[PDB]
């Protein structure tokens, strides 16, 4: 087949000018959509905060209006999903992943309204859920919509605009261009055969998406964490160890999120009303915990700067990790719209911090700043639960700009994904798509 290759090599990277242009517009819409969703999630979290001010004298009334405001929003968003788009529940990444396999529908007229307004319900109530799941589906569907609206035919155009839709949607969720591309190249692309996704296109969409984000968000960063110390070659081994703790814990957590999906189905059966009443109670729990114990509630980003700075007692860190392991599962496994990636950044920061504290006390000759181990553990659960180490490493790199930590970050990531593999664990997105495709047959 040497002659075919001479032919193909000479024809490489000639993406149709139409697919490039349409990737640009997908990028722009996904960016704008991201900002809009972002501004809304906050504005509701504000209204909720200001409510607790107009009634701040009477502490039971306090605990009540906290619970109920989030209960109401939770329900609305569960309902919005159960009623009009049940595949807009949970993450959204397995769905868009499935769609790239040509095995799941891009019901965009149904997901865009349901996912956007459903998330707003669950996110803005202070549930323990992320943006970057929803925005990855919301941006995947936007990518489909402009395929239909302009009726572009071709296999390339369908996988591409779905891919750059999803790419732009993660980039905008974390202000993380390089990390949005890599997610598609490492995790979302079909994993077992060739596919015809144009990478130059995906590049254009993320640029446009990111630039929309910078037009509505500049001067303020998602995680400011300073410049931390360096890492000495004789320190590296401490990170491979930290990795091996994530590699074992990642699959334990995957089990948990699956079984807790199974356990929480037995509570409502499928019954849209026991479901919507169940999310209202979960959401309200968040909205209450959001007041009496905010580290235990919410999306988690807020406390990443604080754990990294080593400003939590060991005692408070251990609390938070358990508590948020609980509220994380309760909120994501229940089926609400919203995701687990960004709260897995929090759980890993909190975990690596606590190791950093141990590792500082045990080795004064190393001159450790427990903050480097927080940065090494931030992308770690992403390497162990969802097995995309290259994305998290570059995700974390982009969000914390501490490139001197690249070797400990890499070394903890291999540790996470080597031990996650070696103790019998599966990519958490892929094990969700499959258990969903297995029900889409039984």
């Amino acid at each position, epitope marked *: 087949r040497r002659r075919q290759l001479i032919r193909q090599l000479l024809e490489r990277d000639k993406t149709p000018l139409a697919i490039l242009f349409m990737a640009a517009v997908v990028g722009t819409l996904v960016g704008l959509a991201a900002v809009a969703f972002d501004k809304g999630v906050a504005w509701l979290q504000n209204q909720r905060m200001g409510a607790l001010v107009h009634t701040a004298d009477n502490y039971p009334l306090l605990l009540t209006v906290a619970f109920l405001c989030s209960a109401v929003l939770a329900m609305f968003g569960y309902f919005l999903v159960r009623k009009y788009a049940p595949e807009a529940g949970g993450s959204g990444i397995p769905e868009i992943e499935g769609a790239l396999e040509d095995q799941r529908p891009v019901r965009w007229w149904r997901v865009l309204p349901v996912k956007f307004f459903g998330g707003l319900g669950t996110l803005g109530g202070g549930m323990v859920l992320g943006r970057a799941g929803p925005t990855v589906q919301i941006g995947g569907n936007i990518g489909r919509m402009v395929l239909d609206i302009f009726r572009l035919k071709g296999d390339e155009a369908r996988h591409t605009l779905l891919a750059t839709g999803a790419a732009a949607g993660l980039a905008a969720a974390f202000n993380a261009p390089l990390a949005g591309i890599l997610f598609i190249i490492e995790e979302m692309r079909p994993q077992f055969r060739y596919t015809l996704i144009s990478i130059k296109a995906v590049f254009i969409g993320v640029i446009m998406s990111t630039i929309m984000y910078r037009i509505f968000n500049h001067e303020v960063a998602l995680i400011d964490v300073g*410049k931390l*110390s360096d890492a*000495p*070659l*004789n320190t590296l081994w401490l990170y491979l160890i930290l990795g091996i703790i994530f590699g074992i814990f990642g699959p334990i957590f995957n089990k948990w999120v699956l079984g807790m999906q199974d356990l929480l189905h037995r509570v409502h059966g499928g019954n849209i009303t026991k479901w919507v009443l169940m999310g209202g109670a979960i959401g309200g729990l968040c909205g209450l915990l959001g007041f009496v114990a905010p580290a235990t509630s919410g999306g988690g980003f807020n406390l990443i700067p604080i754990a990294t700075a080593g400003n939590f007692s060991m005692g408070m860190l251990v609390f938070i990790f358990v508590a948020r392991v609980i509220t994380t599962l309760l909120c994501f496994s229940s089926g609400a719209p919203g995701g687990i990636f960004a709260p897995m950044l929090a759980l890993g920061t909190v975990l690596g911090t606590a190791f950093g504290m141990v590792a500082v006390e045990l080795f*004064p*000759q*190393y*001159h450790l*700043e427990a903050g480097t181990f927080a940065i090494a553990g931030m992308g770690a659960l992403l390497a162990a639960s969802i097995r995309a180490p290259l994305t998290g490493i570059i995700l974390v790199l982009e969000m914390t700009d501490n490139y001197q930590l690249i070797l400990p970050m890499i070394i903890t990531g291999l540790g996470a994904t080597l031990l996650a593999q070696f103790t019998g664990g599966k990519p958490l997105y892929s094990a969700i798509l499959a258990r969903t495709l297995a029900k889409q047959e039984a």
Partner: antibody
Amino acid sequence: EVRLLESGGGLVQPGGSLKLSCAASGFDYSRYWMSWVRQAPGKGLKWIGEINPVSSTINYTPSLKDKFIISRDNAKDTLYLQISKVRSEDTALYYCARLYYGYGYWYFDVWGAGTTVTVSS
Amino acid sequence: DIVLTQSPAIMSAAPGDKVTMTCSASSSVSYIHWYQQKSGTSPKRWIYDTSKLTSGVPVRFSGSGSGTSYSLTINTMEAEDAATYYCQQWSSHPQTFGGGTKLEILR
């Protein structure tokens, strides 16, 4: 040029206290660890303690609760060592050092000329 | 803590002549460092990580060792090589120096 200039030594009466001062110039004095080493007349080198750039971890040699007070003022680009209840054992040349590493085993990178502290009534 | 004991407390050697002092550790030690002190001069880092010279340290200087015994060496000693050489360990904590070795010219 990288210059470490410690000052503040001299004659002090037994049981008193003094505050030595090392002024850094020629490098980002933040981001470096600083340390104190002293040399008793015709004797060995001896480590007093170290302070990390943010002042969140301060080590001292195995010695007495408030005997030494290392601290730093990154705005002033200056490091300080306080000696209290001054004995004759404390009569020594006091050296101010900046800390680094190689393969990660930490060494005493740049020293200053010294200041001498004499403890006599 | 770890006691380091430098061995020839004092010694002399003619210029262009082989010098070899010694460090020794009460417990086990990794990657020792070496400082060159002239009287009235700030102690200078001479040799670090058991073997790496420093910017300026002429090549006649070389250090060696493992585990519990280390050593400095000047293949051809000079006049300007007259000084005191202290070894120092931070392989454990806290870090300790040795007593010294005074290297004096011979004439």
